[PDB]
Amino acid sequence: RAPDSVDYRKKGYVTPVKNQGQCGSCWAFSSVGALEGQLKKKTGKLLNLSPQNLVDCVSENDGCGGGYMTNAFQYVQKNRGIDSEDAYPYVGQEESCMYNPTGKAAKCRGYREIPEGNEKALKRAVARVGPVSVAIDASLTSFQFYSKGVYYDESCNSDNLNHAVLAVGYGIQKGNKHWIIKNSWGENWGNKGYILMARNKNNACGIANLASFPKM
Ligand SMILES: *[C@]1(O)CO[C@@H]2[C@H](Cl)CN(C(=O)[C@H](CC(C)C)NC(=O)c3ccc(-c4nc(N5CCN(C)CC5)sc4F)cc3)[C@@H]21
Ligand SMILES: [Cl-]
Ligand SMILES: [Cl-]
Ligand SMILES: [Cl-]
Ligand code: NA
């Protein structure tokens, strides 16, 4: 039976909160967060992986114009690696792909997709695998102004996915079930870069509509 609550931050599987700046690279931060979690799990080492590597090199995506996490995992697989942040640092603008194998810090051997809309499957994946890449509607002002508690807004549109983030856990706060979400808008946003988002409230903000994780 799956745990009632999980928090990968307590297990050392989660790197510090990043800031994607003014680039549409949410998809790359989400992807690297999932990879970071599997690397820790598999090798015992927590290290920052390179979103810039993805932005510059995942040619099926649109760099700062946006992308899909699935495309990112496929690239890392076909490329036979992803660099560390140190080897390929974040610039926040698309540049030419300059992958450096010497800076390779992780590998990927495929990915899996959570069954569409299923929060129970997403819960079990978070428990069984580690941090999961997810897409949400983050367009509401209520989302932007989040500070604490469990975020729920009826105006959220699960058919208008427009942001990629990382589910690092789940639980309950004061009677409200939640997902522990790591955002990529810096430490000053939300609750030190995180938001608790409502769980089992009919797939609020489309949290389980386009979720995936890498195999390592
Ligand atoms: C995040 O940083 C948040 O804000 C930015 C936009 Cl609004 C949304 N976003 C995404 O990256 C978003 C994430 C998903 C998981 C919701 N994806 C997209 O917006 C997105 C995906 C894919 C493409 C895309 N465009 C392509 N082409 C553009 C047009 N030419 C003619 C062809 C190639 S390929 C491709 F995959 C664009 C955006 C960012
Ligand atoms: Cl369960
Ligand atoms: Cl539950
Ligand atoms: Cl360049
Ligand atoms: Na693809």
**Distance (Å, whole) CA 130 – CA 128:** 6
Known catalytic residue at 163: yes
Query: Are the C-beta atoms of residues 56 and 191 closer than 8 Å to each other?
Result: no
* Domains of the chain: residue spans and CATH: 1-216 (3.90.70.10)
179 pairs with which residues across the strands?
170, 197
Pocket of ligand 1 (CB under 6 A): 20, 24-27, 60-62, 65-68, 135, 161-164, 210
The catalytic residue among 26, 57, 108, 156 is 26
What sign does the CA torsion over 119, 185, 76, 81 have? negative
**Distance (Å, whole) CA 195 – CA 149:** 8
CA-proximal residue: ligand 1, atom 35 (nearest):
61
What is the 3-state secondary structure of the chain? CCCCCEECCCCCCCCCCCECCCCCCHHHHHHHHHHHHHHHHHHCCCCCECHHHHHHHCCCCCHHHCCCHHHHHHHHHHHCCEEECCCCCCCCCCCCCCCCHHHEEECCCCEEECCCCCHHHHHHHHHHHCCEEEEECCCCHHHHCCCCCEECCCCCCCCCCCEEEEEEEEEEECCEEEEEEECCECCCCCECCEEEEECCCCCHHHCCCCCEEECC
Question: Where does residue 119 fall: left (phi above 0), alpha (psi -120 to 50 degrees), or beta otherwise?
Answer: alpha
Query: Are the C-beta atoms of residues 178 and 199 closer than 8 Å to each other?
Result: yes
Minimal CA–CA distance to 32: which of 106, 100, 99?
Answer: 106
- Strand pairing category for 194-198 and 163-173: unpaired
Minimal CA–CA distance to 76: which of 94, 92, 91, 57?
Answer: 57
Measured from the alpha carbon of residue 179, the closest ligand is: 3
Resolution to one decimal, Å: 2.0
| Experimental determination technique | X-ray
**Distance (Å, whole) CA 66 – CA 55:** 9
Lookup result for tokens 């495309």: 71
Ligand 1 atom nearest to 136, measured from its CA = 16
Which class for 178: exposed (0-12), middle (13-18), buried (19 or more C-beta within 10 A)? buried
214 pairs with which residues across the strands?
111
| Distance between Cα 24 and ligand 1 center (Å) | 7
